[PDB]
Amino acid sequence: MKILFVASGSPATVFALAPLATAARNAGHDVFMGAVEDMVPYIASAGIPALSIAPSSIRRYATMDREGEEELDFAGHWFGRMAAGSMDALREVTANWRPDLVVGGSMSFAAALIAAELGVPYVRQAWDTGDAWRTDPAASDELRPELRALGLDRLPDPALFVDICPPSLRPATAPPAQMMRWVPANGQRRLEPWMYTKGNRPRILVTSGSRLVFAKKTGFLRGLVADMAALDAEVVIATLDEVAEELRTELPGVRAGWVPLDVVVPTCDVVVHHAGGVTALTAMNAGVPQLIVPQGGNFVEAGLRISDFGAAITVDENTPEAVEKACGELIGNPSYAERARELSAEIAALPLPAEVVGALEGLVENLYFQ
Amino acid sequence: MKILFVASGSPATVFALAPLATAARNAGHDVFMGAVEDMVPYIASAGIPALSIAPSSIRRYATMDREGNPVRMPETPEEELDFAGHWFGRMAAGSMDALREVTANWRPDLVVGGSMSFAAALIAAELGVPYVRQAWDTGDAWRTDPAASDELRPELRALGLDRLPDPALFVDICPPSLRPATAPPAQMMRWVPANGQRRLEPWMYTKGNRPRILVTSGSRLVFAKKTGFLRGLVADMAALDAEVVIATLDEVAEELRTELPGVRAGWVPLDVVVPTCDVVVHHAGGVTALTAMNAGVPQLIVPQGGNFVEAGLRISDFGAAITVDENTPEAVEKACGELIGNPSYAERARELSAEIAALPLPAEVVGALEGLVENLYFQ
Ligand SMILES: Cc1cn([C@H]2C[C@H](O)[C@@H](COP(=O)(O)OP(=O)(O)O[C@@H]3C[C@@H](O)[C@H](O)[C@@H](C)C3)O2)c(=O)[nH]c1=O
Ligand SMILES: Cc1cn([C@H]2C[C@H](O)[C@@H](COP(=O)(O)OP(=O)(O)O[C@@H]3C[C@@H](O)[C@H](O)[C@@H](C)C3)O2)c(=O)[nH]c1=O
């Protein structure tokens, strides 16, 4: 069958959907994936046919409205405006290539709208362990004109929710879902021996994710690397190649640039990040403790669940003393790695993406979730 | 578990292994794939961790032997088999130094190799781990094993072996109607396309009112640079009321665009465009042949040597293709008219598509790979 995947404005949203999209292609289905114009090379390099569904300028809707608790409301309205700006290209593509099913990420609201316009089932796939649905009332408010055309009062419930959240981190209030084993599918490069080999010292990976807006604030990574000086540890910076250069001149002896996280994370004692959900999943999957230094965003609450479970530490304040002490604890106290391995085991026990493709087939053949 | 995939010197060898490698990654395994240095961007753009296992200069082994002496170009099918076994055998020998360096730091539990990725057989034996051979097309690549075993006698002698060892498992993608009767026993697999991707444009997935003919010479730079092959074939289709599209490397396309007014030329993901085509015209490329058969599209094979000619003749004998005997414009235009006009060719191609579809999925084959490693205690 024809399956349309709808990703968003950041590389992690492509990476989060690539296992289910490649699992569907491997089952013989015709799969296309769409995203913002500058995310198209990430889709193509994940080995998926790539569609541009919005110009890169649509990120202006993060600081502007359609006329020209707060974090939840803001994200719902931002992703809503991004969904609204993606409809023209999605309608043009689907008039020529009509999908039998549409799969969208957590906040890829245009997937919900195009599926309803086509009269085909809509599948929502969680792109992290955060509550995929917390931003829906704000998104429904933003998309009231598109929803009104379909005679809808709010975003419609998906025909199926595919969740990757392990049971120990899943809230009591979480909607029913087809569970799935999350697997990494991040951007790849030519591997160098340091990426898959470790030395005698513990290895600390520091990252601020794959969004250019976050990665450009190099002071965040520079400060975190400086905080680890007292530790006898090797520090590796995983960041965009476009911003790495500036970091290389400022920090001699520290590797900085794109390193496939799935390759290097199993060599790390600690993963230090900005509260990025897909980086959090990569660490949990490899049984690696993590240090979360929240820089706002909508994953902070879900990151606190990982900390409460004991597979991480969320620092109360970004101070050098708090960062170095937490890193020492994550390396030194074996309970953190023990809890991370328990989360890895929970993820491993969930249905494989190949098995979830069977649920999608059954859904389209009107056998399942009827 | 850790699984090492070993591809070869052309992008099609990467594409042929990408479904099983991605299916193993999707099952939670740690998967690395290695190839010659200039094939590394194709592995990385298939979304797989990429290793360079040989310098691009290793391709000198197609024209020189290990003693540095010139190698005669094959002139017969028997000579083509011998030549390919020795050429791939030499490339395997030249890949061992880097494979030994990588596997000393990252020890795979299993090694998967393509049809003639003989270094996969050698590194698996050196590591004492199971070796899986995956067919990269419907051709009988095992027929080059005696010539490859002769070439690799020094590496085999070190392991106390008299010939290349039998794989622990052979994974074959050849549909039953095209599979020869003593093919070795195999775990069958449904082949799926995994070719290099690009930003899609509407012409790629939409068709016009005229039949669409796709012409290609594959993904090897050495063969793609001979643009006269594609130019001649496009000129042969002038009398047909048809849209002609050239699928070729971006690096060689401009020449074809200036020489052929109104004809699109460049990299187009074959899996996307082939379902819009009435005919696929090619040089006897096995992965292009599988892409056409999978989509139920008739094909015109214009053999240019190589080890797929005999397998291409089986597709022609089945009736899902025409192999031209004489490469004249008259033969090419007549065969194209027949492939478009006679519906029997497309119905045979659809029968081959149905046979491929009935085979075990790559996700199911990953289970067979796990079973080889999991049952090691019981031999
Ligand atoms: C810089 C860098 C990144 N990556 C990958 C790892 C991961 O797959 C992704 C980074 O995602 P992350 O969770 O760090 O955050 P972000 O890039 O900001 O993604 C946003 C925010 C997340 O909280 C949410 O889960 C994403 C879907 C979108 O990019 C690599 O593999 N190597 C690298 O060097
Ligand atoms: C030029 C071009 C190529 N491709 C893909 C299609 C196919 O996956 C591959 C081309 O492979 P093909 O079977 O045409 O032949 P070749 O590139 O010469 O590969 C050699 C010879 C084959 O007979 C053998 O099956 C391969 C494993 C190696 O590249 C595309 O998707 N789009 C393109 O525009």
Instruction: Give buried/exposed letters for B63-72 (b at 16+ CB in 10 A, else e).
Output: eeeeeeeeee
State how far the Cα of A125 lies from the Cα of A165, in Å rounded to an integer: 11
Nearest chain B Cα distance for residue A112, angstroms: 22
DSSP letters, B293-343, are HHTT--EEE---SSTTHHHHHHHHHHTSEEE-SS--HHHHHHHHHHHHH-H
Long-range CB contacts (< 8 A, 24+ apart) of A307-315? A309/A168, A309/A169, A309/A339, A309/A342, A309/A343, A310/A335, A310/A336, A310/A339, A311/A284, A311/A336, A311/A339, A311/A340, A311/A342, A311/A343, A312/A280, A312/A283, A312/A336, A312/A340, A313/A289, A315/A291
Task: Choose the closest CB to A191 out of B32, B41, B200.
Answer: B32
Nearest residue (by CA) to ligand 1, atom 28, is A12
Instruction: Give buried/exposed letters for A244-253 (b at 16+ CB in 10 A, else e).
Output: beebeeebee
State how far the Cα of A296 lies from the Cα of B349, in Å rounded to an integer: 56
State how far the Cα of B97 lies from the Cα of B163, in Å rounded to an integer: 20
- Return the CATH number of A1-180+350-370, one of 3.40.605.10, 3.40.50.2000, 3.30.2130.10, 3.40.50.2300: 3.40.50.2000
Q: Going by C-beta distance under 8 Å and a sequence separation of 6 or more, which residues neighbour residue A169?
A: A129, A302, A305, A306, A309, A343
DSSP letters, A205-254, are EEE--S-HHHHT-HHHHHHHHHHTTTS--EEEEE--HHHHHHHHHHSTT-
Task: Record the tokens describing residue A147, joined without a space.
Answer: 């929803």
Closest ligand 2 atom to residue B139 Cα is: 25
Tally Cβ neighbours within 10 Å of residue A105. Answer: 24
Decide if B47 and A193 are in contact by the 8 Å CB cutoff: no
Resolution (A): 1.9
In whole angstroms, how large is the CA radius of gyration of chain A? 20
Q: What 3-state DSSP class applies to B247?
A: strand
Domain spanning B1-189+359-379, CATH class: alpha beta
The dihedral built from the CA positions of residue A31, A34, A40 and A42, taken in this order, carries a sign that is negative
Tally Cβ neighbours within 10 Å of residue B371. Answer: 13
State how far the Cα of A166 lies from the Cα of A97, in Å rounded to an integer: 35
In 3D, which of B278, B256, B283 has the Cα closest to residue B267?
B256
Q: Going by C-beta distance under 8 Å and a sequence separation of 6 or more, which residues neighbour residue A194?
A: A255
**A279, A282, A301: residue to mutate for ligand 1 pocket, most atoms within 8 A of CB:** A279
Residues lining ligand 1, Cβ inside 6 A: A 10-13, 15-16, 127-128, 186-187, 207, 209-211, 214, 238-240, 258-261, 273, 276-279, 282, 297, 299
CATH for the stretch A191-349? 3.40.50.2000
Element spanning A51, H or E: strand A50-54
State how far the Cα of A208 lies from the Cα of A188, in Å rounded to an integer: 18
**A38, A135, A278, A304: residue to mutate for ligand 1 pocket, most atoms within 8 A of CB:** A278
Beta-bridged to residue A178, according to DSSP, are A162
Query: Are B231 and B256 a contacting pair, CB within 8 Å?
Result: yes
Instruction: Give buried/exposed letters for A256-278 (b at 16+ CB in 10 A, else e).
Output: bbbbbbbbbbbbbbbbbbbbbbb
Q: What is the DSSP letter of B143?
A: G
Task: Record the tokens describing residue A248, joined without a space.
Answer: 């290389």
Give me the count of residues in chain A.
370
Tally Cβ neighbours within 10 Å of residue B197. Answer: 24
Distance B229 CA to ligand 2 centre (A): 15
Domain spanning B200-358, CATH class: alpha beta
Question: For B294, which residue in chain A has the nearest alpha carbon?
Answer: A28
Residues in chain A with CB shorter than 8 Å from the CB of B357 are 28
State how far the Cα of A76 lies from the Cα of A298, in Å rounded to an integer: 10
Task: Record the tokens describing residue B212, joined without a space.
Answer: 């669409």
CA distances from B109 to A260, B52, B226 (A): 21, 20, 42
Angle between helices B96-105 and B118-127 (to 10 degrees): 40
For this PDB entry, the determination method is X-ray
Which segments of B are annotated as binding site for Mg(2+)?
Answer: 150
Could you state, in order of their start, the residue ranges of all structural domains in chain B? 1-189+359-379, 200-358
State the ligand closest to the CA atom of A271. 1
Residue type, A52: S
Would B1-189+359-379 and B200-358 be classified into the same CATH topology?
A: yes
State how far the Cα of B240 lies from the Cα of B249, in Å rounded to an integer: 25
State how far the Cα of B209 lies from the Cα of B241, in Å rounded to an integer: 10
In 3D, which of B291, B224, B235 has the Cα closest to residue B259?
B235
Residue type, A111: A
State how far the Cα of A233 lies from the Cα of B102, in Å rounded to an integer: 24
Residue type, B200: L
Nearest chain A Cα distance for residue B169, angstroms: 20
Q: What 3-state DSSP class applies to A345?
A: helix
CA count, 13 A, side-chain hemisphere, A12 = 21
